[PDB]
Design a protein around this ligand. Sequence first.
Ligand code: CL
Length: 171
Amino acid sequence: MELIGDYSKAFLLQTVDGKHQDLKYISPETMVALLTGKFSNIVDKFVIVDCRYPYEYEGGHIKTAVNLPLERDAESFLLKSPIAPKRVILIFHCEFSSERGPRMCRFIRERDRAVNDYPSLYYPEMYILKGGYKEFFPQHPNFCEPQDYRPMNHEAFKDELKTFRLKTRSW
Ligand SMILES: [Cl-]
């Protein structure tokens, strides 16, 4: 397997097959391994980036996840003052096997390459959570807050979906 983004070392986590062949995917069990400190002697900090809209996040998210659905906010949070360490790892996710998580992962890599001298990176190791929140919640509800799941297409949130789409950079 290839080295991480800055070619400094191998990827730390066991991976699973996902839709995008160019990206690295992890399972809910691996996400729990990170949250439970199984990799604490090697991983200084990891950030779970929930790419879903605010109403989805508010309805139930993974504990400690940061909601950064807009490219400009993810860029500001992650790259204005980079989270330095040991390894730093980013895990991106959305509701299921959609495109919000993968798009944000690729965007952050593009910006990280842009602000660095090749091949150095602030976030050389990034993964996508396979199956997103939809598959994580039924496996580990006690690692979620609140213990619920609100889909993007929830009947009572049609206006909220629309309101938030009008804040994105492109459609
Ligand atoms: Cl955006």
